[PDB]
Structure 1
Amino acid sequence: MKTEWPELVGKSVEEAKKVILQDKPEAQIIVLPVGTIVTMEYRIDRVRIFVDKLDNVAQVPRVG
């Protein structure tokens, strides 16, 4: 099962969403600033994308 998207570091939110949904059609994509504190439980259908000030992907997106 695909769980990580290193290839998306540096790319835009739009490009990330497109790629993640090709790979994971059920993905529930959540867009948060880097450094956001995240007390969450694990959701196998969720993919969190941490973005910079310019809404580029700053860290490897991972399922959960």
Structure 2
Amino acid sequence: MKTEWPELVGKSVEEAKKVILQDKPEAQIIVLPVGTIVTMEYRIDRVRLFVDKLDNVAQVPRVG
């Protein structure tokens, strides 16, 4: 199972969603500002995108 998407740093949310859904059709994609604190529970189906002021992916997306 692919768990990380280093190739998406710098890319838009639209691009990131297209790629993650190709790779991971069940993905629940969540978009948060960089630095947002999340709760600890694990979801194998979730991929969070931490984005910058311009809605570009700012750090490597991972499952969880």
* TM-score bin, normalised by smaller chain: over 0.9
Runs of 4+ in 1 over 4 A off after TM superposition: none
> How many residues align structurally?
64
* 1:36-64 C-alpha deviation (Å, 9 max, x unpaired): 01123000000000000000000000000
Q: What displacement does 1:11 show? A: 0.2
Give the whole-Å Cα distance in 2 for the aligned partners of 1:59 and 1:42: 19
Instruction: Give unmatched runs, 5+ long, in structure 1.
Output: none
Give the whole-Å Cα distance in 1 for the aligned partners of 2:57 and 2:43: 20
The equivalent of 1:32 in structure 2 is 32
TM-score norm. by structure 1 comes to 0.98
- Which secondary structure state, in structure 1, belongs to the residue aligned with residue 47 of structure 2? strand
TM-score norm. by structure 2 comes to 0.98
> RMSD between aligned alpha carbons?
0.5
Q: Percent identity?
A: 98
* 1:9-57 C-alpha deviation (Å, 9 max, x unpaired): 0000000000000000000000000000112300000000000000000
Give the whole-Å Cα distance in 1 for the aligned partners of 2:13 and 2:2: 19
Instruction: Give unmatched runs, 5+ long, in structure 2.
Output: none
- Which secondary structure state, in structure 1, belongs to the residue aligned with residue 57 of structure 2? coil
